[PDB]
Amino acid sequence: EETRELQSLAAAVVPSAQTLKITDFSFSDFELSDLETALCTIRMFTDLNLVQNFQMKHEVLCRWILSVKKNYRKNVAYHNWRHAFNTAQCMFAALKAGKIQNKLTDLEILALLIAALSHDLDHRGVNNSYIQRSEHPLAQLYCHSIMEHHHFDQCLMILNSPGNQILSGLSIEEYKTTLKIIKQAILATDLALYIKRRGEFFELIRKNQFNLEDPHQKELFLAMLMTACDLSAITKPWPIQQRIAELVATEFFDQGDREKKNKIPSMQVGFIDAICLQLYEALTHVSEDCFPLLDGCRKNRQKWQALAEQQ
Ligand SMILES: CCCc1nn(C)c2c(=O)[nH]c(-c3cc(S(N)(=O)=O)sc3OCC)nc12
Ligand SMILES: [Mg+2]
Ligand SMILES: [Zn+2]
């Protein structure tokens, strides 16, 4: 923690969502400094009316954002602060440009944004031996989303740290509801849970039976939305997706957590087909304004496929 970094963040004027470009599905953070990602984050909370509706104190939100950023590991090639930051930006864009904002409640929106930013806290890279070196090396077989539970634990720890309580303004009832949604959302980032609950979601959309007014369906939708934002790097403009794919490959193969290069194109195509396409197609069914995510995904598949055939 840098009181210096906080002082500078808290005293800065937060530029518009327009100037920060956070309403664009094509948004990229390569050009941004950490302070700038912090300012973008404040703007996300502000334009979603969260600061106002939940009486968040400026200095507290600033301190919370810095604490969250500080708890991601920079030595992890992909699952780091920038990835969490980008997931939250996608959530913002889907809520605003994608018009999903009108379909949810303020608490659900509050929970989703916090969850997007916090869902990978303390991530140590896909090739970590966290559980492998614990007193329960078999835990993952009992509780597969055990690491996601740990990410949530980190999130809660920060929300309860002195000077970082951005939810202090909620009533105990609002608070309990928000924490529950935040938990579900973070657990939802366990790709295994996504694969397990996909079918039901695709089925409903398919048979035109999808109804957000149904408490079970709304919860399912929140989980699907979390996945959509968490994988959104796959939807970015070609030059940006190439760079993001480089980071993922690094974490995956060069243990950049704490040959393949020629197989990467086909790998990405397989990933897009097996995991991404269906999800983004389903999302567009719920809200056509989310089409750019689907469009971007398709364009990247075309690009990777061309390379796969080797140019
Ligand atoms: C936790 C990883 C999920 C993920 N997110 N993103 C954005 C990506 C991505 O772009 N690519 C991959 C991915 C998946 C495979 S495979 N064939 O095992 O399903 S290979 C790969 O990245 C290759 C560099 N995986 C991901
Ligand atoms: Mg993760
Ligand atoms: Zn993630």
Swiss-Prot record:
<feature type="binding site">
    <location>
        <position position="230"/>
    </location>
    <ligand>
        <name>Zn(2+)</name>
    </ligand>
</feature>
<feature type="binding site">
    <location>
        <position position="83"/>
    </location>
    <ligand>
        <name>Zn(2+)</name>
    </ligand>
</feature>
<comment type="similarity">
    <text>Belongs to the cyclic nucleotide phosphodiesterase family.</text>
</comment>
<feature type="binding site">
    <location>
        <position position="119"/>
    </location>
    <ligand>
        <name>Zn(2+)</name>
    </ligand>
</feature>
<feature type="binding site">
    <location>
        <position position="268"/>
    </location>
    <ligand>
        <name>3',5'-cyclic GMP</name>
    </ligand>
</feature>
<protein>
    <recommendedName>
        <fullName>cGMP-specific 3',5'-cyclic phosphodiesterase</fullName>
    </recommendedName>
</protein>
<comment type="function">
    <text>Plays a role in signal transduction by regulating the intracellular concentration of cyclic nucleotides. This phosphodiesterase catalyzes the specific hydrolysis of cGMP to 5'-GMP. Specifically regulates nitric-oxide-generated cGMP.</text>
</comment>
<feature type="active site" description="Proton donor">
    <location>
        <position position="79"/>
    </location>
</feature>
<feature type="binding site">
    <location>
        <position position="120"/>
    </location>
    <ligand>
        <name>Zn(2+)</name>
    </ligand>
</feature>
<feature type="domain" description="PDEase">
    <location>
        <begin position="2"/>
        <end position="311"/>
    </location>
</feature>
<feature type="binding site">
    <location>
        <position position="120"/>
    </location>
    <ligand>
        <name>Mg(2+)</name>
    </ligand>
</feature>
